[PDB]
Amino acid sequence: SMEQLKHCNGILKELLSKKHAAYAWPFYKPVDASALGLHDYHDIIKHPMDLSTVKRKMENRDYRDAQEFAADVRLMFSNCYKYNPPDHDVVAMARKLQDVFEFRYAKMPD
Numbered sequence: 556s557m558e559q560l561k562h563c564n565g566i567l568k569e570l571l572s573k574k575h576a577a578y579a580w581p582f583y584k585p586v587d588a589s590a591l592g593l594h595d596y597h598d599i600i601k602h603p604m605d606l607s608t609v610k611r612k613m614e615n616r617d618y619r620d621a622q623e624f625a626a627d628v629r630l631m632f633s634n635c636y637k638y639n640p641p642d643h644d645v646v647a648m649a650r651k652l653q654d655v656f657e658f659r660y661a662k663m664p665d
């Protein structure tokens with residue numbers, strides 16, 4: 556399953572690519588709560604995640620298996636859904652990028 560981790564690296568590169576940039580861009584770097592005017596972000600979200608952090612962990616070889624990679628990507632999306640109202644534009648962007656992630660992850664070789 557070095558081959559599964561290589562497939563995961565391929566997914567990450569697709570999520571960061573210009574093809575999906577219209578809805579992926581909020582997830583590129585950690586949420587900057589003071590830059591967005593959010594006073595309570597870190598009171599609600601105890602474990603932040605974003606694509607730059609997933610990339611650093613992949614480059615460092617911190618992932619023991621594909622399931623750990625999926626847990627981080629799904630955490631990133633879940634924090635967005637937890638913090639925001641369900642009709643919010645950033646939740647619509649999260650769902651569009653999650654559609655791409657779940658479809659590619661499901662096609663991973665066993």
Ligand SMILES: COc1ccc2c(c1)C(c1ccc(Cl)cc1)=N[C@@H](CC(=O)Nc1ccc(N3CCC([N+](C)(C)C)CC3)cc1)c1nnc(C)n1-2
Nearest residue numbers: 580581582586587591593634635638639640643644645648
């Ligand atoms: C680099 O920019 C970023 C990075 C991370 C996140 C965000 C933006 C964005 C983001 C927002 C909109 C769009 Cl279209 C796209 C993204 N959202 C942030 C979260 C955020 O800010 N939410 C937010 C929600 C509601 C309000 N209020 C506006 C005033 C209203 N009023 C009644 C008039 C008083 C009440 C409701 C304020 C803030 C975020 N969350 N995850 C990620 C990733 N993000």
